[PDB]
Amino acid sequence: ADVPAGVQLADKQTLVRNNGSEVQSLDPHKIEGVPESNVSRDLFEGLLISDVEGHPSPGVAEKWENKDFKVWTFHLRENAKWSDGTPVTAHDFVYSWQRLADPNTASPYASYLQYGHIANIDDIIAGKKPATDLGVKALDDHTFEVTLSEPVPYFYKLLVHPSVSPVPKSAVEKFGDKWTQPANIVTNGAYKLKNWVVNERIVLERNPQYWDNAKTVINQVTYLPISSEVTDVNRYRSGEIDMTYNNMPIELFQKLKKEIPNEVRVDPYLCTYYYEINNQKAPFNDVRVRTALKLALDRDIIVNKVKNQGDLPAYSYTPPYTDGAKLVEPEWFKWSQQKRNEEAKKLLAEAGFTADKPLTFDLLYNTSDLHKKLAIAVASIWKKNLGVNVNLENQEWKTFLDTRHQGTFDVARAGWCADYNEPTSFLNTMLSDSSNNTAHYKSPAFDKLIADTLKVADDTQRSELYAKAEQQLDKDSAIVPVYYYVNARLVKPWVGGYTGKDPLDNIYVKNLYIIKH
Ligand SMILES: [U]
Ligand SMILES: [U]
Ligand SMILES: [U]
Ligand SMILES: [U]
Ligand SMILES: [U]
Ligand SMILES: [U]
Ligand SMILES: [U]
Ligand SMILES: [U]
């Protein structure tokens, strides 16, 4: 943390953050969500990290160079250490990225190494070459060298993500699945795990071996797993929570902006809220059904009337303000809602649905007051605009993500937040073989458009290709875009260091500080 001259620090430097739900895991290779990544940034540090404004900056790597955007060499700081005092080396990264690539690990982020195009990843994922063939090597204890199969100019931007953080081989090997328990875990970020009580709290304590420990200010941070946004706000306003999670309650938000304006932080965020359609399951493998659902949803009602928190109606998967995004708005988005509804009803009548044999299916969402309120509105809108019946179903976060990976679903509430600010952080997730492809969407045409983006060495051609990839997605109605998020949360006046300037919201508690109050 960089505490401003003249600010007074509180005697006690402790922080309580709500984190939305119980994490899937603390293992960097078994996670894919925001709540998971919130805790991972405090415990595990990769080659680069985001600075307080979100720019990719030195992490374990203090400096790096690239040869033709294909061979990247990272010079690791001599004093990077794990929490047991042993050195963080380039061999740690070698073992780590191989473990990420290995199909036996089953990471939901195995494909992150495809997105960066590390050499031999496709074969490794396919079981054809062992994970040891991956294009990574330690040229020495403090030098990590990555070889890609094509030039990727934005490659380093990917490296702040938890899936490319190191994991400690000895704890992993020795304790297997229990390596992340507090008595076993070893970490290299600014914090260490102190306590982990499932469905109660996660408590982290400063890691004194962290290389930048002298600038760390908060000695302890607790992450809570509260999925009720109302409860989160209540415990924030009672004094227990210093920073809510960034899901705000429909019940209280308008009142909060009028009551504690200075505390309600609202900033740009690179995430899209949509309904994920299970593209491989009838009748959702029919484009007319997906197009109907997409068109009959009234974004104006949902965004402006039912939510009303500053979100923007969405017509694409990649947020239009992502760096490099130059998207074309489909004509349906400028049509009337009435005109959307007729087209929709027309398509469903064409797909064979009547009044007598209507379309009925499940709407799966992760336990939350906000998602429940939004699914109820969407269910009534779909019912009135299109005659479809939906059965709402909630599942705890971890179970919800697993259900979507398994494909044991019809439609699900969904939200993707960028991992790096470039259109492929979204688009690569709809690739046929992506491990992040929970829409279970498979389009040869869509895959070819994205593969083409690294064949050209031009950014204009590249943006035009991302634009057409978004048009292929929309044409197929792979999803139902609903709105582009804003990052809205409550933060106490004594919490310093949070700018709200990072559109990825990659917060590190090592950057925060408690002002005396
Ligand atoms: U004190
Ligand atoms: U650049
Ligand atoms: U940029
Ligand atoms: U269903
Ligand atoms: U509620
Ligand atoms: U470039
Ligand atoms: U106080
Ligand atoms: U106090």
From Swiss-Prot:
**TM segments?**
none
The induction comment states: Part of the opp operon, which is constitutively expressed.
Q: Which GO terms describe its molecular function?
A: peptide transmembrane transporter activity
Q: Which GO terms describe its biological process?
A: peptide transport; protein transport
Principal location? periplasm
* Disulphide-bridged cysteine pairs: C271-C417
Q: Which GO terms describe its cellular component?
A: ATP-binding cassette (ABC) transporter complex; outer membrane-bounded periplasmic space
Q: Which UniProt keywords apply?
A: Disulfide bond, Peptide transport, Periplasm, Protein transport, Signal, Transport
| CDD domains the UniProt entry points to | PBP2_OppA
Briefly explain the null phenotype. Mutant cannot take up cell wall peptides.
The record ties this protein, via Pfam families, to: SBP_bac_5 (PF00496)
Write out the annotated subcellular location.
Periplasm
Q: What else is known?
A: Isothermal titration calorimetric measurements of the binding of lysine-containing peptides of different lengths to OppA show that the dipeptide Lys-Lys is bound with 60-fold lower affinity than related tri- and tetrapeptides (Lys-Lys-Lys and Lys-Lys-Lys-Ala, respectively).
Assembly, per entry: The complex is composed of two ATP-binding proteins (OppD and OppF), two transmembrane proteins (OppB and OppC) and a solute-binding protein (OppA).
Quote the record's domain comment: Accommodates the ligand side chains in large hydrated pockets which impose little specificity on binding. Tight binding is achieved by utilising the hydrogen-bonding potential of the main chain of the ligand.
What is the stated purpose of this protein?
Part of the ABC transporter complex OppABCDF involved in the uptake of oligopeptides, including the cell wall murein tripeptide L-alanyl-gamma-D-glutamyl-meso-diaminopimelate. Plays an important nutritional role and is involved in the recycling of cell wall peptides. Binds peptides containing from two to five amino acid residues regardless of their sequence. Also binds cell wall peptides, such as L-alanyl-gamma-D-glutamyl-meso-diaminopimelate.
Q: Which family does it belong to?
A: Belongs to the bacterial solute-binding protein 5 family.
Record protein name field:
Periplasmic oligopeptide-binding protein OppA
The protein's organism comes out as Salmonella typhimurium (strain LT2 / SGSC1412 / ATCC 700720)
